Scaffold this motif. Structure first.
Motif: not given
Lengths: 421, 421
Positions: A202, A231, A326, A356
């Motif tokens: 992540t 995730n 990100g 990610q």
């Protein structure tokens, strides 16, 4: 993580992202380190290639010569190990640097930090009171709705709710899950711990490592969000194209280590160690149009929860210095807290493209049978106890008692929160 | 902690209870250290007395016998030190093993280990199936009600629930809190971490330190039960007589490190590191009549939840060797698991008298104005996911989907749990 190939054929873009996002990364030293690793791999294959040739002909060389062959073998061995050992050192130093490269933000992102953030829209207003309002702490105190003794037991930045407000916390988390399920998201209940790998995935590691509580004598860490788990479930799978988009509404207890003593100091329900959060997670295809459609859905879901809750809010476009390494785009939803005359963040809607997916290894098979990195998005559905600060203040009656918004009456069994103990 | 007076005047009792409960504690060595420490204190007071007395005469003294007084005074000084120092070492050590001393079992408890446990009574029948019953794993596997990928994210002894079963977990937790609140218990939602003092208070430390996860680089540990937090709230207060009994129903996520390798197959919803638990806790006056009345109530609440939930159960008296050091009585409630062909424990009802009240420092003012150590009791109201394993197997239909008890339909919205995938 970003494509290394593209990092070298277009570093100017990544330099702009490093500058504008305030990331402490020297691109040029990265790129140089990269060409170390690369020369070393070439000279290392060379040495083992030579050694191969020697080893082939060691027996069925005459005794006279096989001795020399052995001497050239040993020295090549000296070499191979010496070279390999330096490549190793370099490779892992590169890998660490590469874990810091920020994704470029979308072209409309405000440039600067927190100050540069821009209000998009505002829906609703600060309530107009026929009596002077109380803050959320005073409402709790008056009505016997929290337990101050928790501080001696568990420490600072901790809360325990009581009577009707304990029930109201649970009603809110159930409500958020049912709302999500009726919007086509898959309701899950999840653990609050994970291996490091899921935090690298992540991008909470390395950049926000200090926000996380480790479990002593394990390889586990407590999570700040269900996003860490959601995730990593599909890490290493190649999802069919027809699975997409994957829509997950994950519930889990959450834990945070700190934040440098609070922006209206320490407490109430505002900043606490342990909380409950229902997150929205989306795994879609590697197109901008599918990311844009998903972003608008996640945002509207949060808006709809706030309308049902009967809260005043506003949307804010988050600036390049405030987004995170990100993010492509981030919009925050903020709710009006009357006692502080101020809007306070309750939701944060993020589009991360494939930053990610490259680190957590999430891939799909597109319509042409090409394997690609997917696009990931997330937003909050509802976190407690932070919205309880806003609900109490916005919905307080002359009495000190609190009204329950309509949509929440079936979940509570009453129209009014009552004083306890 | 036990009363040292009662200990000193009845070691017969404490010796019988050391061996009946399989306590690794030499009572002679403890009683030895107690006497040494008392004699030292007596002596150290005699020295301090004379040491001062002496000086009053030393001002007023014929040179003749001022030698006598310096002599005696200096010897007294040198001795006061050796007494102060020895009393340091011993008083410390006596404390450490006062913490290991067990409470005597109630007369009627079966003597012996887990084998000596005695069925009191069984309520309701095993289900009659018109078809081969699936176990809880096979029902979740068939209906897509659990996320097997969680094992890669969080290691083993993790679960993640999906769809209608995720919602069913949240519904049961709210049901139990509503049931408890209607039964006069005060509802609270609590942290899942507490300082060391709270763990000593209950008796979890030092005996069960092994079963507990610590938050690295901190003075906090994760709780395996809301009891740890509930019991430390009123630590150091003198409760008024009219406040009593305190009845609390706390909810908190709960953590266990599982230093519990196994027996033979338990690896579905049965022994997970993280779960959700609603606990009953009663703090009452130091009367046996009061304890027994509280114990009866605590058990009836649990029997009523199981009736509401349409589950066949039995009651088991727990043996002296299986109770733990602090208990006076323990009654387990066990629920029928059709696939195993046996009863697995769901609730555990305990009376500790004032054994944790003396550790946690819980006191009240009685009807005569004398200050006394209170009596404590506890019992589960409902824990997930262990109760789900029993609900799926007992309520399964032919098609692999599971019926919802009448009492829970208002919490679910539906009468039958539906597959997702």
């Amino acid at each position: 993580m970003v494509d290394l190939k593209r990092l070298r054929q277009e570093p100017e873009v990544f330099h702009r992202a490093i500058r504008e996002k305030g990331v402490a990364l020297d691109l040029e030293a990265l790129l140089a380190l990269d060409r170390e690793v690369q020369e070393l791999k070439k000279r290392l294959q060379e040495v083992q290639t030579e050694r191969n040739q020697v080893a082939k002909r060691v027996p069925k060389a005459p005794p006279e010569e096989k001795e020399a062959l052995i001497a050239r073998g040993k020295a090549l061995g000296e070499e191979a190990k010496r070279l390999e050992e330096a490549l190793r050192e370099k490779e892992a130093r590169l890998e660490a640097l590469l874990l810091q490269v920020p994704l470029p933000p979308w072209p409309g992102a405000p440039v600067g930090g927190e100050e540069a953030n821009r209000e998009i829209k505002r829906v609703g207003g600060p309530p107009e009171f026929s009596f002077p309002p109380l803050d959320h702490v005073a409402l709790m105190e008056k009505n016997g709705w929290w337990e101050p003794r928790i501080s001696q037991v568990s420490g600072s930045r901790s809360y325990a709710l009581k009577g009707d407000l304990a029930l109201y916390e649970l009603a809110l988390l159930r409500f958020a899950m049912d709302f999500m399920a009726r919007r086509g998201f898959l309701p899950m209940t999840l653990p609050s711990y994970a291996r490091e790998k899921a935090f690298l995935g992540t991008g909470h590691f390395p950049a926000y490592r200090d926000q996380v509580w480790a479990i002593a004598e394990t390889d586990l860490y407590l999570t700040g969000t269900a996003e860490v788990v959601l995730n990593a479930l599909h890490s290493g799978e190649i999802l069919p194209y027809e699975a997409l988009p994957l829509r997950y509404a994950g519930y889990a207890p959450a834990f945070r280590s700190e934040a440098g003593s609070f922006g209206k100091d320490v407490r109430g329900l505002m900043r606490v160690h342990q909380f409950h959060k229902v997150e929205q997670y989306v795994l879609t295809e590697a197109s901008l149009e599918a990311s844009d459609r998903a972003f608008q859905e996640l945002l509207e879901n949060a808006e709809e929860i706030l309308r049902l809750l009967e809260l005043p809010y506003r949307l804010v476009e988050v600036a390049t210095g405030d987004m995170g390494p990100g993010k492509w785009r981030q919009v925050d939803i903020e709710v009006y807290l009357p006692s502080e005359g101020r809007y306070r963040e309750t939701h944060s809607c993020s589009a991360l493209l494939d930053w990610q997916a490259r680190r957590a290894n999430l891939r799909y098979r597109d319509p042409e049978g090409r394997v690609r990195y997917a696009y990931t998005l997330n937003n909050t559905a509802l976190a407690t106890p932070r919205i309880l600060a806003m609900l109490l203040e916005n919905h307080q009656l002359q009495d000190g008692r609190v009204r329950v918004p309509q949509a929440l009456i079936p979940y509570m069994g009453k129209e009014v929160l009552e004083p306890c103990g």
